[PDB]
Amino acid sequence: AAIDTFTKYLDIDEDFATVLVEEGFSTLEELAYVPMKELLEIEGLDEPTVEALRERAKNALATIAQAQEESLGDNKPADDLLNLEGVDRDLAFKLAARGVCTLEDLAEQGIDDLADIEGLTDEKAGALIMAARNICWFGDEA
């Protein structure tokens, strides 16, 4: 059951032949480099077909790169995070990598938890956290 894998592999004429189960084509990584001594038994392999295979390999590279970016990008910097003053892109990325993503949890950890931050001392950490607690907790806004 690999119909969802090679959905667009031979985009010229779908009615060509049946897929060889002996190879499988079900790794998406090992098929990058293979000796040409066994991959010519199937008929109908010309220059445009190899060029299209190279296009598809580059596309698969791009897709796996985007997948790795999405898997590592466990930050989700929303508009609610970049709006707090003194928090540029780098600081917001740091906050999101710490493990926070919303506002109702920022003012629930004391200054003892505001360490390990790069480019931010403890007095400024306290300043920013009491600013946040004034905007959120003392403001009584919804």
The tokens for 81 are: 């995070």
Tokens of 99: 């493990």
25 close to 5: Cβ distance less than 8 angstroms: yes
Task: Please give the distance of CA 53 from its chain centroid, rounded to a whole number.
Answer: 25
* Determination technique used: cryo-EM
CA distance 135 to 6: 53
Distance CA 53, CA 20 (A): 16
User: Pick from 116, 101, 108: which is nearest to 133 by CA?
Assistant: 108
Closest CA to 61 of 33, 98, 100: 33
Between CA 9 and CA 102 the distance in angstroms is 43
Both tokens of residue 112?
């003892």
Rounded Cα gap, residues 142 and 138, in angstroms: 12
CATH code, residues 89-137? 1.10.150.20
**Residue 84: how many CB atoms within 10 A of its CB?**
17
The token pair at 68 is: 């790795």
**Coil, helix or strand at residue 48:** helix
